[PDB]
Amino acid sequence: PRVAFYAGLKNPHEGYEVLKFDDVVTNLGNNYDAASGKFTCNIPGTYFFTYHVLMRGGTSMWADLCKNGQVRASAIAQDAQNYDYASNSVILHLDAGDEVFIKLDGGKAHGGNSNKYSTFSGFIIYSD
Amino acid sequence: VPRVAFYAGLKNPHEGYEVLKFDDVVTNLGNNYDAASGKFTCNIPGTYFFTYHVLMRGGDSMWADLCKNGQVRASAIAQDADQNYDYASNSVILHLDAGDEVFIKLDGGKAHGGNSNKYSTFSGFIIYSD
Amino acid sequence: PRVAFYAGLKNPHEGYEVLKFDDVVTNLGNNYDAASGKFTCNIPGTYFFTYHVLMRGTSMWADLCKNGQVRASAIAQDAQNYDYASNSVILHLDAGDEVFIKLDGGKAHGGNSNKYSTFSGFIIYSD
Amino acid sequence: VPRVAFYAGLKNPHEGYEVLKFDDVVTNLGNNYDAASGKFTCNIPGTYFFTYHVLMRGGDTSMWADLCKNGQVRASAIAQDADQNYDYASNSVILHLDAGDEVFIKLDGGKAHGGNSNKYSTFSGFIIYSD
Amino acid sequence: PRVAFYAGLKNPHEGYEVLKFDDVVTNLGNNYDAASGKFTCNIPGTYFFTYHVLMRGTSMWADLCKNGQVRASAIAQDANYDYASNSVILHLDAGDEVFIKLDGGKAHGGNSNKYSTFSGFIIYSD
Amino acid sequence: VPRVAFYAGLKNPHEGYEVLKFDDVVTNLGNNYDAASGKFTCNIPGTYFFTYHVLMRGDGTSMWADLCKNGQVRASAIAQDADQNYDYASNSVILHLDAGDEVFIKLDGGKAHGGNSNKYSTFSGFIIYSD
Ligand SMILES: C[As](C)(=O)[O-]
Ligand SMILES: C[As](C)(=O)[O-]
Ligand SMILES: C[As](C)(=O)[O-]
Ligand SMILES: [Ca+2]
Ligand SMILES: [Ca+2]
Ligand SMILES: [Ca+2]
Ligand SMILES: [Ca+2]
Ligand SMILES: [Ca+2]
Ligand SMILES: [Ca+2]
Ligand SMILES: [Ca+2]
Ligand SMILES: [Ca+2]
Ligand SMILES: [Ca+2]
Ligand SMILES: [Ca+2]
Ligand SMILES: [Ca+2]
Ligand SMILES: [Ca+2]
Ligand SMILES: [Ca+2]
Ligand SMILES: [Ca+2]
Ligand SMILES: [Ca+2]
Ligand SMILES: [Ca+2]
Ligand SMILES: [Cl-]
Ligand SMILES: [Cl-]
Ligand SMILES: [Cl-]
């Protein structure tokens, strides 16, 4: 049996929703579904999954001393890193019908359009 | 010798492009600082020192988990740090004519409201009368 | 042959010790040992391994006081603290060879059963 | 016409909730600032300007995690702890003081850098008006 | 068919060049070439690839390419050591080239410590 | 009563270990501050207040700005962001000065922002008392 998929993330997601990787590059077995973001096992066995998800996260403030509206002194406060990755990998035994997907637990994921910044992939290692 | 000197703290949050209205008035010799407008209005023409310290408002990440059938099987975090507190501060010495206004105006961003803690301040005094 | 494992890190580690991934999810072949944090090869062959290890800010206030009552306050602050050290390898192994993740300074965060820090691998080819 | 003006720097590290003892004394007209206590004591009632600049201690601890075969590194990975930067807690006041009133800088948490004789952290003031 | 490689980056890279992983640890099939930084497919099939690139802080982009076509992208953001990493599964034909190339920034040269890595293996042949 | 007071801003970028030449002169009572050298020169012996605020360019990062009397340091300050943000190196002093004494701000590393006429970085002072 040949089960292997790889998809990237087009659109921004936030909150607690399932990440819907819709830029599908590989999908042997047609077991990944871009409308749901879920891999649904059909061949029972042991599977490898990996994911890389880019977070979308700078503050400044200016205070000027003015005389009759004209600036006589300027000052800035500033404290600007924004883009970072939440990545992991697993190996799981999967029965027929099992769903595997990536879920946000708070925060905002970057939508990379067709650039494949955020990805999700998997393949079967052994079939039962 | 005339006596003009003031010192006031900022109670409420301000933001954007507005005059900061320091309303926790600690000193106001000469009564030339007006907490309702945030403006010092010169009475005695002369040379003045002013200084200000304005605290920028600080603030408080993404979790992505792989689940099998809704059960978490791996967790991952990217941490949004940095939105620290920091200060926009300066000092000047200016000649003022009677009726001149001096004030601190924001030019972008969010100033912390300090309640009665006096984190953000504005002060000044006459050095010489004309 | 069937060799594949996956485990997460329950407790915090620090310094220069082996990471003992003790939340074992998968262990085909029983070649990963959660008591030692080590995978020990039994079938010689070529093996894939990967790992993700989660690492676990300063403020200071100075107030001007008049007879102990605050007349002005100030804060200095410079608060990112959680980042990952992760990598992947492919290695040929002989029987008896051990593969494990080792800290070389720093503090690894203990994730309880959330599996923030993980270690997994599988055989690609046996010899 | 009264003459009251002082200026002092912080030689030694302080932390926690203690009074900052500025003991690198540069100017002390009137002898009203006391380095042993960190306190200015009013003797001429009046209106006073004070200002302070206190440097927070900065600090260098990153994490390395390596996959080993038999103790030999076969992959390395670093997660970097950046931040902790030097930064300042500073403010200025104008206050009316009565005789015997004490003015001083007090930490309310954190670690102040000891500057030895470099005068990174400072405290100064002068009388504007006597009553 | 046995195709599997793993290599580390020795020297600092920067700009828009292909990352030439020259510290080769594994190379079953001899299909990886440290002199070019390229895996060249001999056996057509479905391949797994992964990479982890250490930025020396000017942000760093690192993309996996098939024949120059981006198939995965990764950023490490300089707002100062951070990683740009990703994994792909791709069908390859004979002669197809897979490699990691920088899209701006500075990649750290890890000597033989293997901070910056590139690996792959064939999952299925055709 | 002598009248000595100046206030000036920094127009151009500076860097390294040079004297900051604040050349956007707003106030210069007494004509004792010289924008071409960046130096205040004492002509009336007495006790003086000075203050400065130097914005670090946001390209680097640490920057140090020291107030010097005749080249000797009388205050030090550091700006640091180990993100390359704008931040300030600022301090204030009260000093006794003799005739001919020079007071100026000198960089001790890093890059100072050129603020053109916006007066982001400043240097001021005034006489408190004459001897
Ligand atoms: C200190 As600026 C960003 O207003 O040039
Ligand atoms: C400036 As605060 C609200 O941390 O005391
Ligand atoms: C970097 As420092 C304030 O110890 O000179
Ligand atoms: Ca979680
Ligand atoms: Ca942030
Ligand atoms: Ca800062
Ligand atoms: Ca600051
Ligand atoms: Ca402005
Ligand atoms: Ca990071
Ligand atoms: Ca990272
Ligand atoms: Ca190491
Ligand atoms: Ca830190
Ligand atoms: Ca307090
Ligand atoms: Ca408080
Ligand atoms: Ca790209
Ligand atoms: Ca910072
Ligand atoms: Ca940086
Ligand atoms: Ca110095
Ligand atoms: Ca020095
Ligand atoms: Cl003016
Ligand atoms: Cl009071
Ligand atoms: Cl002196």
Chain-wise SSE layout:
The structure is a homohexamer.
Chain A: E1 4-8, E2 13-14, E3 23-28, E4 32-33, E5 38-40, E6 45-55, E7 59-67, E8 70-79, E9 84-94, E10 99-104, E11 108-109, E12 119-127
Antiparallel strand pairs in A: 1-3, 1-12, 2-11, 4-5, 5-10, 6-9, 6-12, 7-8
Bound molecules: cacodylate ion (3 copies), calcium ion (16 copies) and chloride ion (CL) (3 copies).
Features:
binds cacodylate ion; homohexamer; binds chloride ion; signal (chain F); 5-stranded antiparallel β-sheet; collagen (chain F); 128 residues; mainly beta; binds calcium ion; 59% strand; 3-stranded antiparallel β-sheet; Jelly Rolls
Helix and strand string of chain A, N-terminal first? EEEEEEEEEEEE
What spatial order of strands do you see in the largest sheet of chain A? 3-1-12-6-9
Count of helix runs of chain A: 0
Oligomer designation: homohexamer
Keywords (chain D): Collagen, Secreted, Signal
Protein name (chain D): C1q-related factor
Function (chain D): May regulate the number of excitatory synapses that are formed on hippocampus neurons. Has no effect on inhibitory synapses.
Subcellular location (chain D): Secreted
